[PDB]
Every structure is written in C-alpha cells, then in structure tokens.
Amino acid sequence: QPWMQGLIAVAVFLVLVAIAFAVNHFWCQ
Amino acid sequence: DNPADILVIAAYFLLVIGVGLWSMCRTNRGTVGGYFLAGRSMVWWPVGASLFASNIGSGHFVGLAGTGAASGLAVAGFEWNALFVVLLLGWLFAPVYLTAGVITMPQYLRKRFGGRRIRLYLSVLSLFLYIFTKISVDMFSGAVFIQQALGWNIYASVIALLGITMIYTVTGGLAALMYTDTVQTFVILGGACILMGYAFHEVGGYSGLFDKYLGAATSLTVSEDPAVGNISSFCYRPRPDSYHLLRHPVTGDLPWPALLLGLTIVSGWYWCSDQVIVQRCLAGKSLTHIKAGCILCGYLKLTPMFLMVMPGMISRILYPDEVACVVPEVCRRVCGTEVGCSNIAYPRLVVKLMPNGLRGLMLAVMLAALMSSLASIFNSSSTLFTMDIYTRLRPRAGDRELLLVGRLWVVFIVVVSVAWLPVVQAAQGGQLFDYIQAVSSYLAPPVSAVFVLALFVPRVNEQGAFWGLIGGLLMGLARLIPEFSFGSGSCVQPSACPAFLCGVHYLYFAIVLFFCSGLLTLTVSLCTAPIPRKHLHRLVFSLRHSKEEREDLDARRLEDISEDPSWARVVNLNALLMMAVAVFLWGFYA
Numbered sequence: 081q082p083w084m085q086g087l088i089a090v091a092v093f094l095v096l097v098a099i100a101f102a103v104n105h106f107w108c109q
Numbered sequence: 110d111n112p113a114d115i116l117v118i119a120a121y122f123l124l125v126i127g128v129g130l131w132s133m134c135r136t137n138r139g140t141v142g143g144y145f146l147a148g149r150s151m152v153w154w155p156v157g158a159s160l161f162a163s164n165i166g167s168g169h170f171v172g173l174a175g176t177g178a179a180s181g182l183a184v185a186g187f188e189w190n191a192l193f194v195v196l197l198l199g200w201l202f203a204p205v206y207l208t209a210g211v212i213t214m215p216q217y218l219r220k221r222f223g224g225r226r227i228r229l230y231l232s233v234l235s236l237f238l239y240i241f242t243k244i245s246v247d248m249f250s251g252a253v254f255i256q257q258a259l260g261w262n263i264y265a266s267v268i269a270l271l272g273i274t275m276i277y278t279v280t281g282g283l284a285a286l287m288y289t290d291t292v293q294t295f296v297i298l299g300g301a302c303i304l305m306g307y308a309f310h311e312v313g314g315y316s317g318l319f320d321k322y323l324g325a326a327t328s329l330t331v332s333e334d335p336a337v338g339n340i341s342s343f344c345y346r347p348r349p350d351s352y353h354l355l356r357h358p359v360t361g362d363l364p365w366p367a368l369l370l371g372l373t374i375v376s377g378w379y380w381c382s383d384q385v386i387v388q389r390c391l392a393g394k395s396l397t398h399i400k401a402g403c404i405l406c407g408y409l410k411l412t413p414m415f416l417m418v419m420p421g422m423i424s425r426i427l428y429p430d431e432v433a434c435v436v437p438e439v440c441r442r443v444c445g446t447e448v449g450c451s452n453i454a455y456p457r458l459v460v461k462l463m464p465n466g467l468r469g470l471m472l473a474v475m476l477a478a479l480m481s482s483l484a485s486i487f488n489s490s491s492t493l494f495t496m497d498i499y500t501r502l503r504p505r506a507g508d509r510e511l512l513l514v515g516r517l518w519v520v521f522i523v524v525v526s527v528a529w530l531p532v533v534q535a536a537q538g539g540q541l542f543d544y545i546q547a548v549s550s551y552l553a554p555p556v557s558a559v560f561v562l563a564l565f566v567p568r569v570n571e572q573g574a575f576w577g578l579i580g581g582l583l584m585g586l587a588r589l590i591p592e593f594s595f596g597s598g599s600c601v602q603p604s605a606c607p608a609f610l611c612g613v614h615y616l617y618f619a620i621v622l623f624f625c626s627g628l629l630t631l632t633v634s635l636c637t638a639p640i641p642r643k644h645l646h647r648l649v650f651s652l653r654h655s656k657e658e659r660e661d662l663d664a665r666r667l668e669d670i671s672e673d674p675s676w677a678r679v680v681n682l683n684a685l686l687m688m689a690v691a692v693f694l695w696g697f698y699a
C-alpha cells in the first residue's frame with residue numbers, strides 16, 4: 081500500500097526530529 | 110494565427126510591463142545596493158516566488174517531461190531534493206551571509222579566508238558554469254518548444270527572446286525581476302495546471318496513468334539499417350521500475366543512494382553556494398522573511414512532479430509511436446534526432462490537447478519560465494563580474510560607473526550566448542539533460558565542499574580552501590574530459606566509453622569528489638597555520654551572534670539577525686510541516 085509507506089516515512093522523520101531536540105538539549109546547553 | 114492566442118500573449122506582456130513599471134516607479138536604481146540587491150527590502154512572497162521562478166525554466170518542461178516519458182517518475186528526485194536543501198539555505202547559510210554583509214558569494218570567501226585568489230577563481234568558475242549548465246539548457250529547451258509548437262526559425266526566435274530578456278534585465282535590476290517573478294510564477298503555475306488537467310482527462314484520470322504507462326511501447330521496433338536489426342526489448346519496453354522513485358542501487362538509471370546523497374551535494378551548491386539563488390536571499394527585508402520564502406519555494410517545488418513528469422508519462426501513453434520511437438529512420442522522421450524523441454513529449458501534448466484559446470496561454474507559460482530564468486542568470490552574472498572582477502581592475506570605481514559596467518556585462522553575456530547557441534544545438538536529443546547534470550556533478554561538489562567547511566569548520570584556512578577547489582577541478586576534469594571523448598550514443602547504439610569511467614553514475618562520482626575535496630581541504634588546512642577568531646566574527650555559523658570587533662583579512666542594522674520569537678515560532682513550525690509533507694510524498698512514490 082503506498083499510504084502506509086508514506087506514514088512510515090513520516091513516523092521515522094518525527095523520530096529523527098525528536099532525536100535532534102534530544103541531542104541539542106543535552107549537548108548544546 | 111488565432112485571435113485568442115494573440116490577445117492572451119499580449120495580456121501576458123501587459124502584466125510584465127505593468128509590474129516592471131510599478132517596481133521602477135517605486136525602487137531606487139541609482140545605487141549599487143538598490144540595483145543589485147533590491148535595497149535589501151523584499152518580503153516573503155517576492156523571495157519565494159523569485160526563488161521558484163528563477164529556478165524553473167523551459168528546460169524543466171522539456172527535460173522533466175522528456176525524462177518522465179523515457180524513464181518514469183524518479184526525475185522528481187531533482188525537484189524534491191530541493192525541499193530539504195532550501196531549508197538549509199534559510200536556517201543555515203543565510204543567517205551567516207546576512208551577518209557577513211556580502212553582496213556576492215566569492216566576497217564571502219574573501220572575508221572568510223582572505224586571499225586575493227579564491228574570490229577570482231570562484232568568479233571565473235561561476236561565470237563558465239552559467240554559460241555551460243544554465244544558459245545552454247534555456248536556449249536548447251526554448252529551441253525544442255519553438256521547433257515543435259510554433260515551427261518558426263530556431264535561430265531568429267532565440268535571438269528575439271534573448272534580446273527582449275536583455276531589455277527586461279538591464280531596465281530595472283533585481284527589484285523589478287523579483288516583483289515580476291511574482292507574476293511569472295502565477296502564469297507558470299496557472300497554465301501548467303490547465304495542461305495537467307487536459308492530459309489527465311485524455312488518459313482517463315490518475316488511475317488511467319498508472320494502469321496504461323507500462324504498456325506504452327512503440328510497434329515499430331525493426332530497422333532498415335544493417336548492423337542494427339531488431340531493437341532489444343530492454344530499450345523500447347518501459348522500465349519495469351517506472352513508478353518507483355527509489356530505484357536499484359547498482360542497476361537503477363537513478364540509483365537511490367546517488368539520488369539522496371549526490372543530489373543533496375549538487376543541490377547544496379545550486380541553492381546554498383550559488384549567486385543566482387542566494388541573491389534572492391540577500392535582498393530580503395529580514396531573516397524571518399527569508400525563512401518564510403524558503404518555505405513558499407519549497408512547497409512550490411512539489412508541484413513539478415505533478416505538472417511536468419506525469420504529463421510527460423501521459424504523453425508516452427497517448428503518442429507511443431512518436432514519443433517512444435526507437436528506430437533511427439523513425440526518429441529522424443519524427444523529431445530530426447536519430448537518437449530518440451522524448452523531448453517532443455511536452456511540446457506535443459501542448460500542440461495536440463489545447464483548444465483555440467489556451468495554446469496562447471501555454472506559449473505564455475514557456476515564455477514566462479524562459480524569461481524569468483535567463484533574467485536571473487544575466488542579473489546574477491552582472492553582479493558577479495561587476496562587484497568581483499571590475500573592482501579588481503578599478504578599485505576607486507564608485508556606485509555610478511559600476512552600474513554602467515553592470516548593464517554593459519548583460520549585453521556581453523547575451524552576445525556570448527548567441528555565439529554559443531550553435532554548439533548547444535549540436536547536442537542531439539535528451540542527451541543534453543544528462544550532459545548538464547553530469548557537468549554539475551563534476552564541477553560543483555568541490556564548491557559545496559568548501560562552503561560547508563567555510564561555514565561550519567573554523568579551523569579550515571585559505572591554503573586549504575584554495576587547494577581544495579583546485580584538487581577538485583583536477584579530479585572532476587578527469588571524468589569530464591574522458592567522458593566527452595567517447596560521447597553518449599543511445600540504448601540502441603551504446604558508446605565505447607570504457608565502463609569504469611561511465612558505469613559509475615555521475616551522482617555517485619559527485620559523492621566521491623565531495624569527500625575527496627573535503628579531505629584535501631582539511632588535510633592542507635591542518636598542516637598549515639590557522640586563522641584566529643579575531644579574523645572570523647559573524648562569518649562562521651558558530652560566530653553569527655558575536656557583537657565583537659572583527660579584524661578584516663580584507664550599517665550595524667544588517668549585522669543583526671535577531672527575529673521576533675512569535676514569527677520565529679511560526680516559520681520554525683511551517684518548516685517541520687513542509688518537511689513532513691515532503692517525506693510523506695517521498696514515501697508514497699518510493
């Protein structure tokens with residue numbers, strides 16, 4: 081199904097932006 | 110010859126003259142700031158509409174629909190990489206170039222490293238890139254669309270187009286061009302949506318494209334020429350991964366690691382290190398207006414897969430014996446190019462699907478695309494030459510002589526392009542769109558490699574940056590010269606290029622060349638003595654908020670890139686949403 085591929089892509093993207101907020105919050109301050 | 114077509118072509122000219130006249134009546138073009146950087150006064154919608162219209166040419170219509178017909182939908186790769194890399198422009202590079210107070214991108218490297226030699230080198234490489242990879246594609250694709258749609262003389266018509274974009278360029282500067290590009294983006298998107306509509310109606314919807322495309326083979330697959338004979342089933346049948354962006358990493362026509370890395374690298378030069386796009390980002394009223402326009406451009410850069418690529422695939426379904434020809438005799442009869450006829454895809458949908466009135470609109474679309482792109486190149490090259498080269502030859506120049514020399518360079522770059530038009534007409538079919546993207550992947554990664562180290566790694570010094578660029582030109586020129594030596598041929602007539610040179614996709618050589626320029630720049634930097642921080646304030650991403658007194662290796666209201674935290678909140682949340690939509694659409698077609 082294409083719609084599932086799209087949503088998995090967005091899910092992994094929101095995981096990576098949550099990781100970006102984690103890394104700069106613990107490692108820039 | 111239709112009353113309607115002629116009226117629709119002159120309503121378009123009245124809009125372009127109307128907004129030009131309003132802009133010149135508003136803005137000041139007696140100063141260098143005004144004429145070259147719009148007085149630093151442009152708001153979000155001019156910035157983004159300009160970034161879109163400066164990018165999208167006649168080559169997008171001819172190239173992306175051509176390649177869409179030929180190979181299916183992974184050329185949307187080109188346009189969609191841009192969403193991610195226009196976020197880079199705003200959030201990472203333009204902060205630094207607005208605090209550096211630079212007018213040209215060679216001037217940034219002068220301020221950052223401090224030799225005479227890097228700024229001159231970059232100007233001359235930039236000017237040749239604009240002749241080879243930007244002007245050539247616009248002249249070529251214009252000539253395809255005139256030859257097919259109109260049937261006029263493709264010498265006279267290119268001269269007349271090039272002449273009127275000369276007058277449109279020299280008459281007002283960036284200000285006029287940006288505000289006008291807000292019209293030209295509306296005209297481009299409007300007419301392109303109307304043609305998308307007629308096309309998708311003809312094949313019977315979106316469902317119709319995806320159940321008819323893989324069947325869309327020509328029925329003329331046997332030659333009258335000895336030592337050709339029966340054309341292979343590999344090269345007239347459509348590619349069986351045609352509906353997938355992410356193609357096989359070793360045997361794909363566009364391998365997915367090559368798409369994602371190699372286009373992020375070359376797109377990084379194009380969007381973030383290149384005077385044509387970055388002049389739209391040095392003419393903004395504020396950094397928050399630059400970030401807003403980055404998002405408008407990025408949402409607009411989705412549109413090209415649905416407005417050029419899919420139309421071209423609908424063209425292969427509707428005219429398979431003319432758009433998907435493989436026999437040399439047949440291709441010589443159809444489009445005058447023995448090596449294929451993909452390029453007529455968009456031109457042929459326009460000349461067969463549009464009624465009496467809207468053919469004129471689609472001529473307005475291609476004219477809008479071509480005019481916007483050539484004017485953006487002629488203005489940016491004007492700035493590049495005038496500011497960098499003419500102030501080396503005459504230092505005590507001053508803001509009047511510089512405008513005269515800026516307008517006389519536009520005349521010179523038009524005449525050089527006229528002289529270069531027969532060479533680009535020597536490129537035969539859709540090979541040219543492979544040539545341009547290959548030359549980009551051989552020259553630009555060294556420039557991408559310096560600007561990322563000039564901006565993010567303050568240890569890198571002038572000797573490093575210079576030998577980085579020249580080491581790169583040397584590695585890159587290896588591929589370019591040995592390739593152009595054996596030409597291209599086709600799928601029917603494979604070239605004799607030894608495979609180790611060719612068989613590595615040019616987007617993979619982009620990645621290797623970037624890391625080799627990077628490693629050389631870092632190695633020569635780390636051997637030689639560094640640049641201290643008193644030389645580096647407000648010119649490195651680390652030091653873009655400094656307030657300390659820089660010491661130039663070469664008023665304060667441009668130095669300040671603080672935005673209102675409410676408006677910052679808004680552009681930061683729209684960027685994440687725009688990324689989420691881009692990622693969803695890459696998932697959908699991967």
Ligand SMILES: CCOc1ccc(Cc2cc([C@@H]3O[C@H](SC)[C@@H](O)[C@H](O)[C@H]3O)ccc2Cl)cc1
Nearest residue numbers: 168169172173176187188191375376379542549
């Ligand atoms: C097989 C190749 O066929 C094609 C590749 C690209 C295009 C459209 C095109 C795109 C670009 C830009 O290319 C840069 S990378 C230099 C990207 O960053 C940017 O988003 C693109 O708009 C430049 C010229 C052209 Cl003709 C057509 C055919």
Ligand code: NA
Nearest residue numbers: 162165481482
């Ligand atoms: Na354009």
